[PDB]
Design a protein around this ligand. Structure first.
Ligand SMILES: [Mg+2]
Lengths: 278, 278
């Protein structure tokens, strides 16, 4: 169905989308964490996204702008020479919201369910197509500059080995409480672009920039995510603090924005919390 | 998923199983009706069956014996050099029953739904494994005997051309208000046997015997169907009148039973009405 959403395993008890990740996938071969083979927090969002679209059928006109609220991450998925089957389960609220979970079932005990990520999803009309000032942004973000290699080499010191596919970051501009970052899709994943709406390669890269506040940092809680246009054309990301004043080495809360060449915002994050891996 | 149930296209509005039949299928290449390429009334039952099993998930022990009640047929599916997509839609009743429909959407107007078969499905504990008297049955069914060729040649006069795959009938014994029939799976479909539970080749053949009361006869209304063991081992069918005394050239109501070599009843029909094609 979708590179992270393989088939529909829905019964009368649940709306379900099951997926099996051997390890051959690019997002699972170019994002190494603590030595183990781990799926990125951003991938959980595109499953919840592509679940939702398919959990809704033929409909006349209407609004399409999907808003993912109060997303959380509990336990990363580790892939060790054993195919893992992951289940994305949806529940429609009487009010109209949709809550979701992304769990799996262990190969040792199938009667046990483990939750890797939760949240809510609601469909929403489009607001104004907010456009960021691409020339003005670099002006304030002229204090420090980091190149791709140095950026990625900095992670390898923390032992977070981003392979070819996740090398989407490019130039990185720092300002005061401002972050900017040009990012481009990698050549390896040239073809595979029209299969995704929230392409992991660029998105995770956008999340990678948020760590430039400075142990492996892991997505913890995102309180809002707004999708407008497909995350393909967009090669610019912009990270700033959220108006919470909550800064520290264990909990940090940001507002990230990705945008087209022109600067048309296509994805918009708010309240994104990152937490250290133990 | 299943040779007549291809994938699961379920949304929050409906439990769905969509299937596309090009015409290459055996049950759609060996059952010609009025010159047009038509799907057999029996195939609608195995979709409703295999829908149901998959519309129910992981469960601890429990009863498995699926009972299809008040099945009806409205409009045959005609396949004319154009792939047709057929949708099997399920609805769970508060009481516990499950009603179903098997519709499609036309290639000229997609906003229109056409219903080919309806009914109810309920899950039920197994009753006693009723066994028929195979030696005693031929005793009373010794009045008239028809061979395979003559049987099938009789249909071709009505222009119902059963090809290799639907040539499952063998010996046919007639008694007074009794019908018997040995039937065997065809060599063409030797491999494809473990893919079905209600194998069309034998089942339709069992329905073919019911017409031996004597225009193309078409299944109209079956008020009960009970499945116990997979319709693979079973090579014997037995057709008798239902205790309704409702006999005639337009409406006829029977009780068919299929059974193993030994005689273990695996499928059991009751109240099966057949009606003439206009
Ligand atoms: Mg439902």
């Amino acid at each position: 169905i979708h590179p992270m959403l393989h088939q529909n395993t829905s019964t009368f008890s649940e709306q379900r989308f099951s997926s099996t990740f051997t390890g051959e996938e690019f997002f699972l071969a170019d994002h190494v964490v603590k030595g183990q083979r781990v799926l990125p927090g951003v991938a959980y969002l595109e499953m919840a996204r592509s679940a939702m679209e398919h959990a809704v059928g033929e409909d006349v006109h209407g609004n399409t702008s999907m808003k993912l609220q109060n997303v959380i991450w509990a336990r990363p998925i580790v892939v060790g020479d054993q195919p893992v089957r992951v289940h994305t389960g949806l529940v429609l609220e009487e009010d109209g919201e949709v809550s979701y979970q992304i769990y799996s079932e262990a190969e040792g005990s199938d009667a046990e369910i483990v939750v890797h990520s939760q949240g809510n999803a609601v469909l929403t009309p489009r607001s104004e197509l907010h456009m960021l000032d691409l020339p003005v942004l670099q002006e304030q973000c002229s204090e420090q500059v980091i190149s791709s290699e140095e950026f990625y080499e900095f992670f390898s010191a923390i032992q977070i080995d981003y392979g070819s596919g996740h090398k989407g970051i490019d130039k990185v501009y720092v300002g005061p409480g401002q972050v900017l970052a040009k990012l481009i899709l990698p050549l390896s994943v040239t073809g595979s672009v029209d299969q995704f709406v929230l392409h992991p390669s660029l998105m995770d890269s956008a999340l990678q920039a948020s760590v430039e506040l400075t142990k492996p940092v892991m997505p913890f809680a995102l309180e809002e995510m707004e999708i407008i246009r497909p995350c393909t054309s967009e090669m610019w990301a912009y990270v700033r603090y959220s108006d919470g004043s909550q800064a520290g080495n264990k909990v940090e809360k940001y507002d990230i924005d990705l945008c087209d060449d022109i600067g048309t915002i296509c994805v918009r994050m708010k309240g994104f919390t990152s937490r250290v891996l133990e």
